[PDB]
Each structure stands twice: as structure tokens, then as C-alpha cells.
Amino acid sequence: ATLDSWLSNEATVARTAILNNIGADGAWVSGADSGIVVASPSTDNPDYFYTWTRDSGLVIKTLVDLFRNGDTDLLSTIEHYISSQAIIQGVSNPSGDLSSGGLGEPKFNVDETAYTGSWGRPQRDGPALRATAMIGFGQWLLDNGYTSAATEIVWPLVRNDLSYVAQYWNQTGYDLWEEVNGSSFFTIAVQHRALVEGSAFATAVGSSCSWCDSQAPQILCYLQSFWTGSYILANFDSSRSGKDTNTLLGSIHTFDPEAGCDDSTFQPCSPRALANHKEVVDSFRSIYTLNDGLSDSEAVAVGRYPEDSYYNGNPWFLCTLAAAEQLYDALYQWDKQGSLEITDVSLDFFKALYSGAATGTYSSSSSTYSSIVSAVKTFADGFVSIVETHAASNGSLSEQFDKSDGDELSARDLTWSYAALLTANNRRNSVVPPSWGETSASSVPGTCAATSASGTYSSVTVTSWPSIVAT
Numbered sequence: 463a464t465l466d467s468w469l470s471n472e473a474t475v476a477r478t479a480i481l482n483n484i485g486a487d488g489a490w491v492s493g494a495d496s497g498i499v500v501a502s503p504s505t506d507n508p509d510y511f512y513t514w515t516r517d518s519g520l521v522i523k524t525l526v527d528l529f530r531n532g533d534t535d536l537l538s539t540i541e542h543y544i545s546s547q548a549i550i551q552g553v554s555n556p557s558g559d560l561s562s563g564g565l566g567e568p569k570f571n572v573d574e575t576a577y578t579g580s581w582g583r584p585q586r587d588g589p590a591l592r593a594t595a596m597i598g599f600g601q602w603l604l605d606n607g608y609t610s611a612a613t614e615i616v617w618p619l620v621r622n623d624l625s626y627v628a629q630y631w632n633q634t635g636y637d638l639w640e641e642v643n644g645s646s647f648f649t650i651a652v653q654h655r656a657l658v659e660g661s662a663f664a665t666a667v668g669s670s671c672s673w674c675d676s677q678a679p680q681i682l683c684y685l686q687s688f689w690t691g692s693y694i695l696a697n698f699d700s701s702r703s704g705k706d707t708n709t710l711l712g713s714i715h716t717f718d719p720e721a722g723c724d725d726s727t728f729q730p731c732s733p734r735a736l737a738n739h740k741e742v743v744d745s746f747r748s749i750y751t752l753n754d755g756l757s758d759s760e761a762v763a764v765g766r767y768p769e770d771s772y773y774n775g776n777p778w779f780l781c782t783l784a785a786a787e788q789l790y791d792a793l794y795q796w797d798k799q800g801s802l803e804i805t806d807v808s809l810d811f812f813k814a815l816y817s818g819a820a821t822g823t824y825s826s827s828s829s830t831y832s833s834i835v836s837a838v839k840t841f842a843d844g845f846v847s848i849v850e851t852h853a854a855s856n857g858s859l860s861e862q863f864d865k866s867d868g869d870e871l872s873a874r875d876l877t878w879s880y881a882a883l884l885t886a887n888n889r890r891n892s893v894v895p896p897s898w899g900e901t902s903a904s905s906v907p908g909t910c911a912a913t914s915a916s917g918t919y920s921s922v923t924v925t926s927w928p929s930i931v932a933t
């Protein structure tokens with residue numbers, strides 16, 4: 463269709479735009495140091511000309527997956543990023559120093575100096591996301607015989623971030639949207655993931671991560687509290703409803719292609735994640751004029767949370783794409799398992815798309831399976847069409863699009879918007895990320911304990927990168 467062709471061309475635009483936003487050769491961000499991912503080239507109204515640990519980590523993880531799939535030209539970009547982080551980790555900032563909380567700092571100036579003004583800090587999801595991005599490259603390094611780079615450069619940087627996660631996971635902080643000071647689903651979910659793959663990586667380089675091991679099961683134990691019985695609570699200590707795309711992001715970014723539809727880890731096809739998906743998406747159906755007239759079986763423009771007032775509260779490209787990505791992941795999981803199950807928890811999600819839905823197990827060769835996956839694929843593609851409809855003619859994706867007229871607003875050419883497009887497109891094409899070991903990390907302890915474990919901190923100096931040839 464035109465969606466297919468638009469996506470193929472947009473994926474090329476997205477890759478280029480991301481590179482334009484990374485220093486020190488990025489065309490849109492002169493001033494940014496080497497390997498510094500800038501959130502947006504917008505220097506004013508709003509000023510997003512800074513580097514966020516979260517956006518950077520999410521973007522780099524996307525680039526690492528493309529690289530491992532054959533986009534070898536991204537190698538230098540990844541190396542520069544890792545080199546820049548060795549410096550950033552040691553930058554004394556309002557959150558602290560390397561070993562005293564500095565790693566939880568949300569953003570920095572593009573020249574690698576600390577941002578000293580007031581900001582919602584700390585944001586504990588950053589160290590987890592940065593660790594996950596680096597671990598993926600470290601795995602490639604190990605697999606391709608560059609053991610030294612993995613052991614001496616990557617591992618020590620990762621060890622710092624994992625120590626921060628294990629030490630402070632059970633403390634409040636700001637959510638990914640930088641507004642709620644409390645405890646957040648997305649954050650807890652990505653932290654659990656980071657400790658699990660961090661322990662596997664530590665073992666691989668001949669070291670260990672005892673703190674990853676003791677804390678991961680406890681974080682997972684706590685993660686269960688976010689399920690309300692009908693949807694996933696985005697944050698504790700909040701007065702909002704709790705329906706928030708924060709939860710869809712938590713699911714797609716902790717998706718493991720080897721995982722079943724596990725409720726404990728909220729995988730994309732888990733009854734809990736599907737039930738949550740309908741609750742979150744439905745919360746935007748009546749608040750945006752842009753959604754007027756659409757029925758419940760049709761995709762709609764999705765924002766962050768229904769109570770949002772940032773720029774008056776509008777749909778976001780990355781949030782609308784996350785709604786589609788969770789479904790592409792679920793389709794992949796159902797296909798790989800050879801069946802789909804409908805339970806009392808997920809019945810409403812399915813019934814909205816296929817009125818004949820009934821609880822039961824449906825094999826991939828059954829008529830019901832076929833009807834359901836077709837309906838789900840159409841629904842998912844629907845979200846992507848809404849994005850296509852509001853992107854600029856040359857493919858530019860801003861942070862938000864107007865709730866009434868769909869015009870682009872807020873930060874222009876948002877790097878995260880482009881990475882979200884690349885991942886949704888990949889999943890749509892059944893291109894999945896490497897597994898993180900969910901299959902041996904979904905067991906919940908019988909009793910949850912408020913605890914922590916302190917790891918270790920040590921400053922890393924990147925003397926030089928070996929002549930790595932990636933073919």
C-alpha cells in the first residue's frame with residue numbers, strides 16, 4: 463500500500479535525521495561534542511538543545527540494533543557515543559559525582575558540561591537505558607573477537623550504571639516525562655531488564671555482578687504492584703488516573719522475542735499488557751478533536767496521558783508509534799508460539815476488534831486466529847497511518863502534533879521521534895532485537911523486600927579504540 467512505501471522512504475529519512483543530530487559532525491547540531499546525541503536542534507521555544515541520558519540511550523540502542531543487522535557504517539557513531547559517556551559519567555553535576563548519585567542526572571549541555579538550573583532530577587531510568595545500549599554493542603564486540611574493547615572499555619562503563627541502578631531503584635525520582643516525583647512503571651521495568659542483561663554480560667567478560675543478581679528479582683517483585691486489576695498504573699505518588707503511554711513504552715522496550723505472553727514482565731502479548739493497551743488508547747478517544755468520529759475498532763492519535771497540559775496536551779508521534787509497536791511485537795510472539803489465547807483479562811481488547819471473541823486458546827491454523835491477527839495488524843497499521851498523515855511533507859517528525867488540526871508543534875526534528883519510527887517499522891517487518899534473558903528472569907519472589915545493594919564505581923578513561931572492522 464502507500465503505507466508500505468511511505469515507511470520504506472521514511473525509514474531512510476529517520477536514519478539520516480538521527481545522524482544530523484549527533485555531534486560533532488551532525489549537520490543540525492554544530493556545537494555538540496563527539497558522540498553527543500542532541501534531543502532536537504531547536505535552541506528556543508522550546509530549547510531542546512541538550513543531551514538527555516534517556517533519549518541518547520534509546521536512540522543508540524536503536525542504532526546498535528541496525529548496526530548488528532548490517533548497517534556497518536554506524537560503527538564510528540556508536541564508538542563516539544561510548545567515548546562521550548566515559549566523560550559524562552565523571553561530570554560533577556547537581557545530582558552528584560560519579561559515585562555519589564551523578565549518574566541519575568537527566569540532561570547535560572551538548573559540550574559535555576553540567577546543566578545547573580532547576581530540573582526534575584534525578585531520573586533513574588537513564589543509567590538503565592544507557593547500560594542496555596552499551597551492553598548490546600559489547601555483545602557484538604565479544605562475538606566478533608574484539609574482547610579487549612568489550613572487557614576494558616564497555617564493561618567498566620556498564621558496571622558504573624548497573625551499580626547506580628542496584629543502589630537506588632527503591633527510591634523515588636522523576637518519571638520519564640520529567641514531571642512526577644514518585645515511583646514509575648517504565649523506570650522500574652527498564653531497570654529490571656538492565657540488571658538481568660548486565661549480569662549476563664558481566665559473566666561473559668569473565669567478571670560478575672552480584673548486585674545485579676540480588677536486586678533483579680526484588681525489582682521484579684515490586685513491578686507486580688503496578689498492575690491495578692484493569693490496567694498498569696503509570697506512577698505511584700500521583701493524583702492522575704495512571705493511564706499513561708509510559709506503560710506501553712515500558713512494554714515495547716523490555717520486549718524479548720524469546721518470551722511468551724508473560725504477565726510478570728508485562729510482555730507485549732501478555733493479557734495484562736493487552737488489557738492495558740485498550741485502557742490507555744481509549745483514554746484519548748474523546749479528548750482530541752482529531753479523534754472525533756472514529757469507532758472503537760479504529761486507531762486514534764495517542765498522547766502521553768489524558769491529564770497532560772504540556773503545550774495544552776496533544777498527541778505525540780512517539781506515543782502513537784508505541785501503540786502500534788506493542789501490537790507488531792504481539793503479532794510476532796503469537797506467530798512464533800503458533801497460538802493466541804484470550805482470557806477474561808484481555809477479552810475486551812479482542813472483542814473491540816473482533817466481535818466474535820471468546821475466551822479460549824486459538825491455534826495459528828484456526829479460523830479465529832486468522833480473523834484476529836488480521837484485525838490486529840489493521841488496527842496497528844492504523845496508528846502508523848495517523849503518523850504518516852501528520853508528518854511534514856519531507857518526512858520531518860516533531861515532538862507533538864496538534865490535538866485539533868494535527869499540525870506539528872513543540873520541538874522540531876525530535877531524535878526520539880525518528881528512533882520510534884525505526885523500531886515500529888522494524889517490528890512491523892518482524893525484525894526483532896536480541897533477547898535479554900527474560901525467559902530466566904520472570905519468576906517472582908514469594909515476598910518483596912524494600913532493599914538495595916551497593917556495587918562499585920570507578921572512572922573509565924578511553925585511551926583508544928582498536929581498529930575495529932565491521933563487515
Ligand SMILES: *[C@@H]1O[C@H](CO)[C@@H](O[C@@H]2O[C@H](CO)[C@@H](O[C@@H]3O[C@H](CO[C@H]4O[C@H](CO[C@H]5O[C@H](CO)[C@@H](O)[C@H](O)[C@@H]5O)[C@@H](O)[C@H](O[C@H]5O[C@H](CO)[C@@H](O)[C@H](O)[C@@H]5O)[C@@H]4O)[C@@H](O)[C@H](O[C@H]4O[C@H](CO)[C@@H](O)[C@H](O)[C@@H]4O[C@H]4O[C@H](CO)[C@@H](O)[C@H](O)[C@@H]4O[C@H]4O[C@H](CO)[C@@H](O)[C@H](O)[C@@H]4O)[C@@H]3O)[C@H](O)[C@H]2NC(C)=O)[C@H](O)[C@H]1NC(C)=O
Pocket residue numbers: 475479489490491492493503504505506507508511854856857858860870871872873874875
Ligand atoms: C524538512 O523541511 C523543514 C522546513 O525547511 C526543515 O526544517 C527547517 O530546518 C531548518 C534548518 O535546516 C531550521 O532552521 C533553523 O531555524 C531556526 C529558527 O527556527 C524558528 O524560526 C523559524 C522561522 O520562523 C519564521 O519563518 C517561518 C517561515 O519560514 C514562519 O512560519 C514563522 O512564523 C516565522 O516568521 C521557524 O520555522 C521555526 O519553527 C520550527 O521550529 C519550532 C521549534 O522547534 C517548531 O515548534 C515549529 O513547528 C517548526 O518546526 C522556529 O520557530 C534558527 O535559529 C536556526 O539557526 C541556527 O542554526 C543554523 C544552522 O542550522 C545557524 O546558521 C544559526 O546561526 C543558528 O545556530 C544556532 O543554533 C544551532 C542549532 O539550531 C547551533 O548548532 C548553532 O551552534 C547555534 O547555537 C548557538 O546559539 C543558540 C541561540 O539560540 C544557543 O541556544 C546555542 O546554545 C548556541 O549558543 C536554523 O536556521 C528551520 O527552523 C526548520 N523549519 C521548520 C518549519 O521546522 C527540516 O529540517 C526538513 N527535514 C528533513 C528531514 O529534511
Ligand SMILES: *[C@@H]1O[C@H](CO)[C@@H](O[C@@H]2O[C@H](CO)[C@@H](O[C@@H]3O[C@H](CO)[C@@H](O)[C@H](O[C@H]4O[C@H](CO)[C@@H](O)[C@H](O)[C@@H]4O[C@H]4O[C@H](CO)[C@@H](O)[C@H](O)[C@@H]4O)[C@@H]3O)[C@H](O)[C@H]2NC(C)=O)[C@H](O)[C@H]1NC(C)=O
Pocket residue numbers: 631632633634644645683684686687688689690691695697698699700701910911912913
Ligand atoms: C520499595 O520496595 C518496596 C517493596 O517492594 C515497595 O513496597 C511496596 O509498595 C507498594 C506501593 O505502595 C505497595 O502496594 C500497595 O499495597 C497497598 C495494600 O497493602 C495498596 O493499598 C496499594 O494500592 C495502590 O496500588 C494499587 C495497585 O497495586 C492500585 O490499584 C490502587 O489504586 C493504589 O494506587 C493508588 O494509591 C497509591 C498509594 O499506595 C498511589 O501512590 C497511587 O498513585 C494511586 O493513586 C498498593 O497496592 C506494596 O504493598 C509494598 N510492598 C511491601 C512489601 O511493603 C516500595 O513502594 C518501594 N518504594 C519505592 C520508592 O520504590
Ligand SMILES: C[C@H]1O[C@H](O[C@H]2[C@H](O)[C@@H](O)[C@@H](O[C@H]3[C@H](O)[C@@H](O)[C@@H](O)O[C@@H]3CO)O[C@@H]2CO)[C@H](O)[C@@H](O)[C@@H]1N[C@H]1C=C(CO)[C@@H](O)[C@H](O)[C@H]1O
Pocket residue numbers: 501510514516517580581582583638639640641642772876878
Ligand atoms: C523538556 C521537558 O519540559 C517540561 O518539563 C519541565 C517543566 O516545563 C517545568 O515546569 C518543570 O516541571 C515541574 C512542574 O512545573 C511541577 O508542577 C512538578 O511537576 O515538577 C516538575 C519538575 O520539577 O521542570 C520540568 C523538567 O523536569 C515538560 O513538562 C517535560 O515533559 C519535558 N520533557 C520532554 C523532553 C524530552 C527531551 O526530548 C524527553 O526526555 C522527555 O521524555 C519529554 O517528556
Ligand SMILES: *[C@H]1O[C@H](CO)[C@@H](O)[C@H](O)[C@@H]1O
Pocket residue numbers: 724900901902903904905
Ligand atoms: C520467565 O522466567 C521464569 C524464570 O525466572 C520462568 O519460570 C517463566 O516461565 C518465564 O520464562
Ligand SMILES: *[C@H]1O[C@H](CO)[C@@H](O)[C@H](O)[C@@H]1O
Pocket residue numbers: 679902903904905906907908
Ligand atoms: C523463581 O525464581 C525467582 C528468582 O529469580 C525466585 O525468587 C522465585 O521464588 C522462583 O523460584
Ligand SMILES: *[C@H]1O[C@H](CO)[C@@H](O)[C@H](O)[C@@H]1O
Pocket residue numbers: 911912913914915
Ligand atoms: C535490603 O534488604 C535486604 C533484605 O531484605 C538485604 O539483603 C540488603 O542488604 C538490604 O539491606
Ligand SMILES: *[C@H]1O[C@H](CO)[C@@H](O)[C@H](O)[C@@H]1O
Pocket residue numbers: 629630912913914915916
Ligand atoms: C541501598 O539501600 C539499603 C537500604 O535499603 C542499604 O542497606 C544498602 O547499603 C544500600 O545503600
Ligand SMILES: *[C@H]1O[C@H](CO)[C@@H](O)[C@H](O)[C@@H]1O
Pocket residue numbers: 561629915916917918919
Ligand atoms: C555503595 O556502598 C558501598 C559500600 O559503602 C560502596 O563501596 C559503593 O561505592 C557505594 O557507595
Ligand SMILES: *[C@H]1O[C@H](CO)[C@@H](O)[C@H](O)[C@@H]1O
Pocket residue numbers: 917918919920
Ligand atoms: C568497587 O569494585 C571495583 C571492581 O572490583 C573497584 O575497582 C572499585 O575501586 C571499588 O572498590
Ligand SMILES: *[C@H]1O[C@H](CO)[C@@H](O)[C@H](O)[C@@H]1O
Pocket residue numbers: 618919920921922923
Ligand atoms: C576503577 O576501574 C576503572 C575501570 O577499569 C579504572 O579505570 C580505574 O583506574 C579503577 O581501577
Ligand SMILES: *[C@H]1O[C@H](CO)[C@@H](O)[C@H](O)[C@@H]1O
Pocket residue numbers: 548549550551552553560920921922923
Ligand atoms: C571518570 O571520572 C573522572 C572524575 O571522577 C573523570 O575525570 C574521568 O574523565 C571519567 O569521567
Ligand SMILES: *[C@H]1O[C@H](CO)[C@@H](O)[C@H](O)[C@@H]1O
Pocket residue numbers: 920921922923924
Ligand atoms: C581513566 O584513567 C585515567 C588515568 O589514565 C584517570 O585520570 C581517569 O580518572 C580514569 O580513571
Ligand SMILES: *[C@H]1O[C@H](CO)[C@@H](O)[C@H](O)[C@@H]1O
Pocket residue numbers: 923924925926
Ligand atoms: C588507556 O590506557 C592508558 C595507559 O596508560 C590508561 O592509563 C587508561 O586508563 C586507559 O585504560
